[PDB]
């Protein structure tokens, strides 16, 4: 509802592999405390087309810049894979 649980889309080889070929799959990063139903509700209130299904990924934080004077950890990401129905393709930018 408040729509702070849809943080950010990401574009990689996997993302572009899915975002082509009939069914499109759009991968965003979401609030790690949000649930699948919340993801569907947010997409409803901000896009307007019911997702066919939602998949979630949790990537654990890991050490980065090892050996550098100040080492640091990563940031916790939750990934969401929206799939719009056949033949529909909306733009992530431009509303």
């Amino acid at each position: 509802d408040v729509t702070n649980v849809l943080l950010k889309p990401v574009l990689t080889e996997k993302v572009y592999f899915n975002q082509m070929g009939e069914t499109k799959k759009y991968v965003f990063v979401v609030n790690p405390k949000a649930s699948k139903t919340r993801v569907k509700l947010a997409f409803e209130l901000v896009y307007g087309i019911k997702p066919l299904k939602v998949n979630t990924l949790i990537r654990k934080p890991t050490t980065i810049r090892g050996g550098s004077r100040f080492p640091g950890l990563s940031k916790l990401e939750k990934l969401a894979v929206i799939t719009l129905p056949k033949g529909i393709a909306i733009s992530v930018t431009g509303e």
Binding site: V10, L11, T12, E13, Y16
Partner: peptide
């Protein structure tokens, strides 16, 4: 022609070389 020349190296953040998008090479590195 121009798009072949602009696909060489110039690796985008989340991608590698070779499979540079045939249409999307003008947004980040504009």
């Amino acid at each position: 022609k121009q798009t072949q020349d602009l696909t060489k190296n110039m690796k985008i953040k989340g991608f590698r070389k070779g499979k540079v998008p045939p249409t999307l090479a003008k947004d980040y590195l504009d």
